[PDB]
Amino acid sequence: MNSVTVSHAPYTITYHNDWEPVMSQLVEFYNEVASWLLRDETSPIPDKFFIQLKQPLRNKRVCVCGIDPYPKDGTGVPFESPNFTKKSIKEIASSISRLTGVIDYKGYNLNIIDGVIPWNYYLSCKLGETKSHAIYWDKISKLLLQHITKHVSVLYCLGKTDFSNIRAKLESPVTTIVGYHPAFEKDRSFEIINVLLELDNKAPINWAQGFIY
DNA sequence: GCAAACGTTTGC
């Protein structure tokens, strides 16, 4: 674990070594933009913007990616709903339920699954307003996704419209599935990932690991 | 000539 300083909130950004190559420039960028961003009340709170950089990449082979945080109640961990109230994580969980067969769970969290990194493309939004901070995160979102793509061998993207042309942001031909936003083809997406992983000679994902009991 | 942008459906 390392740490860097930025001019505006949250002042200190704590990151895992794997992200080193990218921080210098993330700081340049955030310093240009935080000024405005922070004038809006955000989801998540600024202290939580970057907590997912505390996550290692070395041990990750899938990235499950959505466009930006939940309009309200973002925790800084993508997809996470601690009280299991958010529509998107609940639907993901029904999906995983049906593949695995596990039907008696209490919640679900993509961020506790081995080899998986859940990700928000944009790192914050204005409270109640989806994609409202796209222009602030723009180059940062790109910088980071390219970095994640150097480590994972499958990028799974939720949202046909937004990620229709996600390839245009990438510097390699990484395997990329573009599914629907969480709103029965989704099942097929989580299983094809494992098919692809094996064909490519890699360990599959135990999606049942996400379950909270 | 697609990859855009607009409008319509319908799902939350």
Place this chain on the structure above:
DNA sequence: GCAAACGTTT
């Protein structure tokens, strides 16, 4: 009244 996907558009 929203946000996403889809079907025609330029």
